[PDB]
Each structure stands twice: as structure tokens, then as C-alpha cells.
RNA sequence: CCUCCGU
């Protein structure tokens, strides 16, 4: 079963104004009520991009 | 994916 599981948080980004960033606002779509972590605009998952290295 | 800088 699933009990223990690590967490991979890759921080990145920083080019916008926190116009009175509401503690109950969304820092994604700018919607008030839901959090970015719960942004209904976010893409479905699991489905993340891959780096896929190949020469260079 | 894009706008998750707030964990
Ligand atoms: Zn949102």
C-alpha cells in the first residue's frame, strides 16, 4: 500500500507583482477563493513534462 | 502549458 512517499518540490519563477496577494487568492489565474495549488485552471495529471537528454 | 513569487 501507499504510506511513505518522498516529495520533490522544484522551485522556480519570479516575475510578477504580488498586488496585495490575498491569503485566500490564487497566484496562478488570479482567482479569489481557491489556491493555486487548487487552481481549476491547472492541467490534469499525472502528466508532467520530461527533460529527455540527448547529446549536448 | 501558460499566471503556482504564498510551502
Ligand atoms: Zn486559480
Q: Look up the domain containing A43 and give its range.
A: 1-56
Q: How many angstroms separate the Cα of A16 from the Cα of each of A20, A43, A47? A: 12, 21, 26
Question: Which of the 1-56 residues on chain A come under 7 Å of nucleic strand B at their beta carbon?
Answer: 9, 11-18, 21-30, 35-37, 41-43, 47-49
| Rounded distance between C-alpha atoms, residue A18 and residue A42, angstroms | 20
Cell of A24: 485566500
> Burial of A47 by CB count in 10 Å (0-12 exposed, 13-18 middle, 19+ buried)?
exposed
Number of domains in chain A: 1
On strand B, nucleotides with any atom < 7 Å from a protein CB are 1-7
> Burial of A26 by CB count in 10 Å (0-12 exposed, 13-18 middle, 19+ buried)?
buried
CATH code of A56's domain: 4.10.60.10
Cell of A5: 512517499
**In contact, A40 and A32? CB cutoff 8 Å:** no
By what method was this entry solved?
Answer: NMR
What secondary structure does DSSP assign to A1-56, as a single string?
---------------S--TT--TTB-SSS--BSS-GGG-TTSPPSS----------
| Rounded distance between C-alpha atoms, residue A10 and residue A8, angstroms | 6
**In contact, A31 and A17? CB cutoff 8 Å:** no
Amino acid at each position: 500500500a501507499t504510506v511513505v512517499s518522498g516529495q520533490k518540490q522544484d522551485r522556480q519563477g519570479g516575475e510578477r507583482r504580488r498586488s496585495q496577494l490575498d491569503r485566500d487568492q490564487c497566484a496562478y489565474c488570479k482567482e479569489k477563493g481557491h489556491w493555486a495549488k487548487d487552481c481549476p485552471k491547472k492541467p490534469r495529471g499525472p502528466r508532467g513534462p520530461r527533460p529527455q537528454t540527448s547529446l549536448l
